[PDB]
Every structure is written in C-alpha cells, then in structure tokens.
Amino acid sequence: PLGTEGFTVIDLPEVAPDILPSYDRCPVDDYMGNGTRFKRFSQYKLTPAEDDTWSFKRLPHRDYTTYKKFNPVGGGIRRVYEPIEVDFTPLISEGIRELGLDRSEPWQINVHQNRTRADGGRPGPLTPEGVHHDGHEFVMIAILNKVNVAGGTTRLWKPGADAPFWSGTLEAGQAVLLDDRGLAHDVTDVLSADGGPGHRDIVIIAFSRWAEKWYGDEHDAAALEE
Amino acid sequence: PLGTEGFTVIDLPEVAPDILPSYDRCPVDDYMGNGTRFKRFSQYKLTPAEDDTWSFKRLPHRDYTTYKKFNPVGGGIRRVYEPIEVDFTPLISEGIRELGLDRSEPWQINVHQNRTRADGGRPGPLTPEGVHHDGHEFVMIAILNKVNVAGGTTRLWKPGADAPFWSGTLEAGQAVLLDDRGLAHDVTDVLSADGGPGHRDIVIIAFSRWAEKWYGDEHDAAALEE
Ligand SMILES: N[C@@H](CCCC[N+](=O)[O-])C(=O)O
Ligand SMILES: N[C@@H](CCCC[N+](=O)[O-])C(=O)O
Ligand SMILES: [Br-]
Ligand SMILES: [Br-]
Ligand SMILES: [Br-]
Ligand SMILES: [Br-]
C-alpha cells in the first residue's frame, strides 16, 4: 500500500486519445477559483471483482456537496456540475493497485476533472481551502497536462505542523496517492510560465468506503447542515 | 474613542440620494466571491483640518493589493477595480468622529464599495478569508442597504480564540468600528430571506497612518512579495 510516510508518487500509463481534449469542454466552476477553474464531476461505486480486479459503476448524477469543516470556501452548498464525459477508470485502477484498497467492502469515489488557468498577473489558485484534509480516507491527484505553467507545487503536512515535510511539483503523467486522514495537503498557485495564458489539467479522486459514502440524501443533509 | 472591548456600533446619518442607486452600477468582483460580489474601490489621503474636522483627497487610482498573510484567498495579486463614483466621505466622517483618530499625523484610507448577492441555494459569502485581521489599524464597516436577506452576522474574536465574544447582525443604517489589531472578525454568509434574490450593500473603510499606508510602489511590492 502507501509509503511509510502516508503517500506514494506514481507514473501513469498512457491515456486514451479522448482524455486530454476533453478538458477544453469543461465549463467554468461557478463556485471555486473566481473564474480560473473549469470542472466536470462524476461519482462511482467501486466493487471488488473476482480475479482480484475492481468494477466501476457510475452513479446517478447529483450535485456535489462537501462540509465547511473540510472546505471553508466551497463547503455547505449544493454545487451543480456537469458529468464527466470521458472514462477515467483505467487511470484510477492504477491508483487502486498502489493503494491496496480493502477488498472486504465496497467503496465510493468522487471524481473531479479540473482545469486551472493562469495568465500574466493572475495566478490560478489550486487550494483556496489552504492546508486541508479532503475528509475522505484516500485521495489520488493525477496530472494529465500542463501547458505554459510554473508553480503548482504539492506540499504535504503533518497535522498542526508549521511547515510541510514533503514538497514536489507533480508533472504531467504523475499522480500522488494520499492518506487523507493522516496527512494534510496544499498546492501552490499555478503561474504563467512566460506572461501568457497557461493551464494545468488534473483529475482528483476521493475514496470513501460505501458505508461512509459521500453520496445521497443523508450525506447531503449532513454536509449542508440541514 | 472605541469601546473598551475594541469596537463600537453606531447609527449612520441619512445619506445622499445618489448613494443607494450607485450599487446597481458596481461591476462584478473578478477576484472574490465567485460571482456573488460586485465592487468599486478608491483610496484617499485623510488629513486633520482646522476647526477640528478632516479633509479628504482622492488619490490617483491604483490596483488594490493586499497580503496573503491577512487574506489568503485574495492576497498577493493585483486586483483591478473601477473607482467609486459617489462620495462616501460624509459617512466616513461619522466613523472618524467616533474613532477619535489621532490628529498628530495624516492617514490613508482604502474604501471598498461592495454588493453581495444571495439567492435560493446560493448564499453570498462575506468573509471567505475566515476569521481574520484586515492588516490595518482601524476598520469601519457600514451597511447601506439590505434587501430580502438574512444571515450576515458579524462576529468579533479575541486573537486566537475558538469562539467569538460578540455577535450581531448589522442592519441598514448601522456601522461597526473596529480595532483591527486587537480583535479579529468574520461575518456569516448572506442568505436569501425567502428563496429569491436578495442583496447586501456595504462600504468598508480601512484606516492606516500615512507612514504605514497601503498605497504606492513600496506597498505593492511588499504585498505581491516581489
Ligand atoms: N476540495 C475540492 C474537491 C476535492 C475532492 C474532495 N471530495 O470529493 O470531496 C473542491 O471543493 O472542489
Ligand atoms: N478583505 C477585503 C478588503 C477589506 C478592506 C481591507 N483593505 O483595504 O485592505 C477584500 O479583500 O476585498
Ligand atoms: Br475560491
Ligand atoms: Br473567494
Ligand atoms: Br496633500
Ligand atoms: Br442582532
């Protein structure tokens, strides 16, 4: 499973030819990033399959809801996103293999397909939450494309620490897997590499056991404090 | 001067008839509030005048810059805003009288004319910074108009405290004056009162001594970490 410090960085396999172009068709995120972020969102059930594989089932499309206690800037509201068009589940299966997810019960994943844009004088913020936990058990963050950007350095923190214990800029074709309970994280802003427009295209996958799923009326009521 | 707990709430005089309509002509804030906020911005030199009054001089229009250490979601960047069209200096004089601003040196003020909109299912965030200091010596927040909104409760905090020591919902025609060093503040989100659109129209005035002004090349370089 994960490295002893609670994270692993991996190389990603080649992706299908529809993945990178699909980022050009992500609409603006009306809730986060103040116009610098573009997003699609889908959720899946993840079940252990015989032959020691995993089965993915796309769930009916629902608004994204998270808790203010994890995300103070985007929590506590219904966030209406459009579904992801392409199939990230081959990519996600690489992360699962490295996580060694507990096969004794089913899992539920949130999948966020994000583009953040940077331009001269306007960095693209990646973690306006600051140093945070996502609220899930594991998180996978995969970088699919970077064009004309600098910055975007991932920092991993022990809870309460004054400084991160690991920093690294993930490049296209890399992913980090995180123990999202034991570690906190942030990412420095995306910067324009030369003064002109640039962008950073990623997918974030948040893993929870189905028994603790971030999906459905009970989760929504809890996250919205209803 | 201010109350012994570092703040005072005051009633405001009647304002000129052009002030309330001017909020309809404030452009969207491209940098904060994710489309829920509209803003104009101007800066003034503030000097003591004989017969125990104060004189205001509007300074050449410059981008707003603040520090990430005070504002993690809107700091560290050049924020290009349009100037304020109306004259808030009569209202600001009411706050100055209550502050008892030291007349032994000149001052510099930042003036933010803000509208935050709320709608059903979409609150209007007021302090995405969370509990914060603005970074100035004194702050005045004046409420000019509230239409069909709830929430928007000001909370004042001792430094490092885990709960506020005072809470109150400022109404149209009220202002709070704050010791921005000795106390921190936040405000709960603006909510739609009935499920439909509503808005809250305010002006924020941040006071610094001219010797510590938030204006000009040196300030900008420090706030941008250049
Ligand atoms: N904090 C990110 C989402 C990261 C994934 C967490 N999850 O699915 O709850 C956002 O609010 O857009
Ligand atoms: N934190 C508010 C500004 C409040 C006044 C503070 N000032 O002038 O620096 C914003 O970023 O829009
Ligand atoms: Br944001
Ligand atoms: Br914001
Ligand atoms: Br002068
Ligand atoms: Br009240």
UniProtKB/TrEMBL annotation, chains A, B:
Keyword Metal-binding among UniProt keywords: yes
Binding site for Mg(2+) 1: Y64
Residues that bind succinate: R200
Record-listed Mn(2+) binding positions: H132, D134, H185
Chain positions recorded as Mg(2+) 2 binding sites: T66, D134
UniProt-annotated binding residues for 2-oxoglutarate: R200
Keyword tags: Metal-binding
Protein name per Swiss-Prot or TrEMBL: BsmA domain containing protein
Originating species: Streptomyces sp. CFMR 7
